[PDB]
């Protein structure tokens, strides 16, 4: 009776932390046409119409958003897929020619003085021996003067040659799911008060994660998820100011971003089957692109954020908001995409407030750049084609990326400024609740049974 | 159609249950272990890696004379040095994850002992049968 | 060299024969199941897919306690609801394809019943052996 032996159990319900390669999966609705997109949906396996989520009763799991391989893996996957999508498109090397540029006095407002430049230049046609003199419009942030006459060149000409994006390809983000392969499991922490790291008692297993939209943004988290309980704050080290702070909103903030200029697209034949899309004459008035938010909603969201921050930095602390300290335009401005056009918005009007221990709309200006060096890479630039007509988009602000200024001793005040620059922080807001584990079906146990001799 | 559904023993959702209670759902996970030019190659590599892992586990099971059986008793004695405990508190109070955490240190020696015992048993059985 | 050749039991050419007569050539097809940068990857993917299919079939056979055996009896009763018929007309008049067509509807419930019966039998055998 007391004597007992060892027995082997297979297919056992145990796991351990591990890193592997997941695979993409997209909804069947994307299969209905729309086969031309940056985020390849034809290459993704169709998703489960009724995904299964199995709750793990009596299970507590340790999660760590910051040391998660999924964020880096999917960032690399996005970069590679973007490069692959841009590979077959037209290579815009002939544009690197001297341009004769003048100002645009075509009913421009006072704030748009010098932003647009009318540039004429020679270019090769379908026949190399022949050349054509053509004119276009370029934003001030896309041309640099070279030294009477005024000669300008594309900003990228001394760095690399851009690859014009194929017009048929859509920049619109689509929901994406990541599924672990066989032998691996994905764990989701269902706790509504989870702060991004530590133990989680409410856990479940899912083959595929929920739909994730790879939205590219800085200083803001557009079209993201919303915390069920209230506004939440996550940080690798809240005390350390060198670490970014991710803020998730309980309720979205509606933001309307518009470019009111009636742009015109003009096709130029660079060579055999090479088409270049240029910005022609603008019909009508010219006005600065701008984004609008609700003042009252933003104020209430900032108040909730201030309360939740005081929950970590002490009740009697002055909470101040300041704009970005400085640097390149990518991090100093809210940079994102809207209907195929890239916007760089000056957010000094949204982080300008001070909070003591106790129908109006905010309008902020935005600038347009047709040449983009995203992912902080150098030597790979894309020329964004112009889009005819006005541009209007309505989005949800659901999160913020903030940085705390280093305060000397205890100055009973704290200043937070928009930051970012690393898309991994943007990705971490959606994959915080997900972890990857590897199964170990083998298991030895003590059992009184003894195999026959 | 009177409100019925599936109510199927699914994924590791039973891992939080006790040892013996969780032994019910071993086969479903065993079956799940085989669920099913820059991205297709990576997903194919993941599939092949899962295949090798499962096949190596099956080879290890077969080497110990337990092929084709989820549960297989063995002739190796259970030394009390690893974890004495007792039978009652193991199969009714402790979960599989806690047991794996406790016994993670001496797994290799258990594998070697099972290997050696199975080889000796196979040779003894061959000699005994050749005797008859 | 008197006119002899091979006369080997080959591919599914015996599928048109009866149930019992076609049971002779199961193993040859079982062996055939493993017959053996834009095109090599595709052919490798086909090979890996065949490998996963065969390995999944072997796993299903092992889960029902029939690993390593082409023919394995089971403890699940044969309910007459699926197809009553009788033994004489099945193994001497009907072919394998017709039987598969007839019984294609209830295959999953058969698989589940075999799974549950094998698990129960394994646990009962473990308890009985531990009793001794």
């Amino acid at each position, epitope marked *: 009776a007391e004597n007992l032996w060892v027995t082997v159990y297979y297919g056992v319900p145990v796991w351990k932390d591990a890193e592997t390669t997941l695979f993409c999966a997209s909804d069947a609705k994307a299969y209905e046409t729309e086969k031309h997109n940056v985020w390849a949906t034809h290459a993704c396996v169709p998703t489960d119409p009724n995904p299964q989520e199995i709750h793990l009763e009596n299970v507590t799991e340790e999660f760590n958003m910051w040391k998660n391989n999924m964020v880096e893996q999917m960032h690399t996957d996005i970069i590679s897929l973007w490069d692959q999508s841009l590979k077959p498109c037209v290579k815009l090397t002939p544009l690197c020619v001297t341009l004769q540029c003048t100002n645009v006095t075509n009913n421009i407002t006072d704030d748009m003085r010098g932003e647009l430049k009318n540039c004429s230049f020679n270019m090769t046609t379908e026949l190399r021996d022949k050349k054509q003199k053509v004119y276009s419009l370029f934003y001030r942030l896309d041309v640099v003067q070279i030294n009477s006459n005024k000669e300008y060149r594309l900003i990228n000409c001394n760095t690399s040659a851009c690859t014009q994006a194929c017009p048929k390809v859509s920049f619109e983000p689509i929901p994406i799911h990541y599924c672990a392969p066989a032998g691996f499991a994905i764990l989701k922490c269902k706790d509504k008060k989870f702060n991004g790291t530590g133990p989680c008692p409410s856990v479940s297993t899912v083959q595929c994660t929920h739909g994730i939209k790879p939205v590219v943004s800085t200083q803001l988290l557009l079209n993201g998820s919303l915390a069920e309980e209230e506004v939440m704050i996550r940080s690798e080290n809240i005390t350390n100011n060198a670490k970014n702070i991710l803020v998730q909103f309980n309720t979205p903030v509606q933001i309307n971003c518009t470019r009111p200029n009636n742009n015109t697209r003009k096709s130029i034949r660079i060579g055999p089957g090479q088409a270049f899309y240029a910005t022609g004459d603008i019909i009508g008035d010219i006005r600065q692109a701008h984004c609008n938010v609700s003042k009252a909603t933003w104020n209430e969201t900032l108040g909730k954020v201030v309360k939740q921050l005081r929950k970590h930095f002490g009740n009697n602390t002055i909470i101040r908001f300041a704009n970005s300290s400085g640097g390149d335009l990518e991090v100093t401005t809210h940079s994102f995409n809207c209907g195929g056009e890239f916007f760089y918005c000056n957010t000094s009007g949204l982080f300008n407030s001070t909070w003591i221990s106790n129908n109006d709309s905010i309008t902020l200006p935005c600038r347009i750049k047709q040449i983009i060096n995203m992912w902080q890479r150098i030597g790979q630039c894309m020329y964004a084609p112009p889009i005819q007509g006005v541009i209007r988009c309505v989005s949800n602000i659901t999160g913020l990326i903030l940085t705390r200024d280093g305060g000397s001793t205890n100055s009973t005040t704290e200043t937070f400024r928009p930051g970012g620059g690393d898309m991994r922080d943007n990705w971490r807001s959606e994959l915080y609740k997900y972890k990857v584990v590897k199964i170990e079906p083998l298991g030895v146990a003590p059992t009184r049974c003894k195999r026959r001799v | 159609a*009177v409100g019925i559904g599936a109510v199927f023993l*699914g994924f590791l959702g039973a891992a939080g249950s006790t040892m013996g209670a969780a032994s019910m759902t071993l086969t479903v996970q065993a079956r799940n272990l085989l669920s099913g030019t820059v991205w297709g190659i990576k997903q194919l590599q993941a599939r092949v890696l899962a295949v090798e892992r499962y096949l190596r586990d099956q080879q290890l099971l077969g080497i110990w004379g337990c092929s084709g059986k989820l549960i297989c008793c063995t002739n190796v004695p259970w030394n009390s040095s690893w974890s004495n405990r007792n039978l009652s508190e193991i199969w009714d109070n402790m979960t599989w994850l806690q047991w794996d955490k406790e016994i993670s240190n001496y797994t290799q020696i258990i594998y070697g002992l099972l290997e050696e015992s199975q080889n000796q048993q196979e040779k003894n059985e061959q000699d005994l049968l050749a005797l008859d | 060299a008197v006119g002899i050749g091979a006369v080997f039991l080959g591919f599914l050419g015996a599928a048109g024969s009866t149930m019992g007569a076609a049971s002779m050539t199961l193993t040859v097809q079982a062996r055939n199941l493993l017959s053996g940068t834009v095109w090599g990857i595709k052919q490798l993917q086909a090979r890996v897919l065949a490998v996963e299919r065969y390995l999944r079939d072997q796993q299903l056979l092992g889960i029902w306690g029939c690993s390593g055996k082409l023919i394995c009896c089971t403890n699940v009763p044969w309910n007459s609801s699926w197809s009553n018929r009788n033994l004489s007309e099945i193994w001497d008049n009907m072919t394998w394809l017709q039987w598969d067509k007839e019984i294609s509807n209830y295959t999953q419930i058969i698989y589940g019943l075999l799974e549950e019966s094998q698990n129960q039998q394994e646990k009962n055998e473990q308890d009985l052996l531990a009793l001794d």
Partner: antibody
Amino acid sequence: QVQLEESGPGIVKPSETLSLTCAASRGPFSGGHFYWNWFRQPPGKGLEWIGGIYSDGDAADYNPSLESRVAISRDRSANRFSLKLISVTATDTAVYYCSSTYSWNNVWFDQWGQGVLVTVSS
Amino acid sequence: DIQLTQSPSSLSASVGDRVTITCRASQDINTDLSWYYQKSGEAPKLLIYRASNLQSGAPSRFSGTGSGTEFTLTISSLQPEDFITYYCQQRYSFPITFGAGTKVDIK
């Protein structure tokens, strides 16, 4: 292995609101649909069906004769489900049962429990 | 609503006597019917499921037959524990209804 326990007031005055609550359990099964149903067994007659609710959905089915008087809700955090009956009459005096029926492959289990007595009097 | 009628309403028999209970449905329900057994003081329990698949744990002396609007529960040999009340329940589309109930008493 699901055991369902019933709670509520033993005596409810006529035309008042009768509220009963039962503890939902899932047993060894990890994933599926559980149909938590409320019944009643008035003394001297057979059992009667009141209503039911799915585990994975908030949709509720009710007996046609008690559609306007019977409501059933659930709370997953406490894993409970409650039944509220309004305009209680003398005929509502019954043994109320909370039941769950498993739906494993071609078996159709069913568990009921013990129930609770409810009497309507002034 | 589907009305289920049970016959006999009340029956008296001795131990070991073979007894039969018949249930009629107001409309066709195919084979989606079951029979439950209950005694005063305890909740009803399933006796025969689908009328053609014996419920696990139930004695083999109980047999279910019939389909459509006619179902039959037959007990070959009565037992002291079999002097209980039997109900027929249709597992068809809603609403859900139960049989009138047959009472078995010792004579």
